[PDB]
């Protein structure tokens, strides 16, 4: 018909990885569409991800556009599908590694970034209402490089969504979830109070910062830039435990370096301002999506 389905599309190239879902590109009537692949024993994962990307009113041009789930049997096996919108660039870790940015690109990518999460964690009141939702694993590897340079959330299969009238999550979440790297200090120590909904919305503003210091080593300023860099590179090992994560950032209380030349750039003083403001301890002291969009809007203006 008119909708795009599963047995209309043929896969072409591996493209990666998830935490269960194999990721391909696959063609869709002439165009490029990604695919995500999960076997039947994986079923739980595949549902509860299409089942956040079919939120009422979730479409926003920050958020990976969903197109949809659907099962395809090969006449041995299902397949378990999630099919998006491709984004040739692909994440933005892979677009950190390969690129540098100029101050426009950076803000570029923070505000796309910081408004793809106001629009998650935003309550939207109406007939056609939507929920409050806190992403649970944002990290470079998680956003998209759109052709346009703007930025789009992805990776939704971790997300909690919250009722604010009987003050209720859709979900029984379990503890330490997303990538032990991006972990906020009250999730590698396991203080977060699971039973308020603000501390998922708190632990990824903490992640966001993590993000936005990514990017801000690669916004080059006459040929000037860090070379790229995962957050905590300097103090813990590839795949770091949560005891090597917490012992760095919660006792030790380190968070990524602020270079002395980010100080020279209005653009980078914002940024190293609002990263700093991500990475209190206490979530409650952490600056919201709503209030970083509002502050990177501004600045996007003033360029
Ligand atoms: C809801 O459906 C989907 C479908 C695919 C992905 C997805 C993609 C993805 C998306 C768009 N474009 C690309 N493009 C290039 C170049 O890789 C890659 N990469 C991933 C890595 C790990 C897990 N999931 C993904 C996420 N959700």
Same mark, same amino acid.
């Given at each position: ?8 599309? +043929?896969?072409? !190239?591996?493209?990666? #990885? ?12 002439? !165009? ?38 659907? &099962?395809?049997? /090969? ?27 100029? @101050? ?50 992805? =990776? ?17 979440? /379990?503890?330490? +979830? ?8 009250? +999730?590698?120590?396991?203080?977060? /109070? ?8 708190? *632990? =990824? ?5 993590? @993000? ?30 949560? !005891?090597?994560?917490? #012992? ?8 990524? &370096?602020?270079? &002395? ?5 209005? *653009?980078?003083? @914002? ?33």
């Amino acid at each position: 018909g008119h909708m795009t389905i599963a047995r209309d599309i +043929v896969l072409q !190239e591996s493209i990666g #990885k998830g935490r269960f879902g194999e990721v391909w590109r696959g063609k869709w009537r002439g !165009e490029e569409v990604a695919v995500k692949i999960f076997s039947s024993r994986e079923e739980r994962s595949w549902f509860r991800e299409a089942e956040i990307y079919q939120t009422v009113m979730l479409r926003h041009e920050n958020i990976l556009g969903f197109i949809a789930a659907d &099962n395809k049997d /090969n006449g041995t096996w299902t397949q378990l599908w999630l099919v998006s919108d491709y984004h040739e660039h692909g994440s933005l870790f892979d677009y950190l590694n390969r690129y540098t940015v100029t @101050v426009e690109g950076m803000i570029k990518l923070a505000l796309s970034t910081a408004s793809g999460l106001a629009h998650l964690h935003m309550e939207i009141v109406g007939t056609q209402g939507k929920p409050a939702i806190a992403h649970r694993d944002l990290k470079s590897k998680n956003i998209l490089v759109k052709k346009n340079g703007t930025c789009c959330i992805a =990776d939704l299969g971790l997300a909690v969504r919250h009722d604010s009238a009987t003050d209720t999550i859709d979900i029984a979440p /379990n503890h330490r +979830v997303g990538t032990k790297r991006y972990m906020a200090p009250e +999730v590698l120590d396991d203080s977060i /109070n699971m039973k308020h909904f603000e501390s998922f919305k708190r *632990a =990824d503003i903490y992640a966001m910062g993590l @993000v936005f210091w990514e990017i801000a080593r690669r916004c080059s300023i006459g040929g000037i830039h860090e070379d790229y860099q995962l957050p905590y590179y300097d103090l813990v090992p590839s795949d770091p435990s949560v !005891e090597e994560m917490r #012992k760095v950032v919660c006792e030790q209380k380190l968070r990524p &370096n602020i270079p &002395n030349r980010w100080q020279s750039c209005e *653009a980078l003083r @914002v940024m190293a301002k609002i990263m700093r403001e991500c990475w209190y301890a206490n979530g409650a002291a952490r600056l919201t999506a709503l209030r970083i969009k509002k502050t990177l809007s501004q600045l996007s203006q003033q360029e």
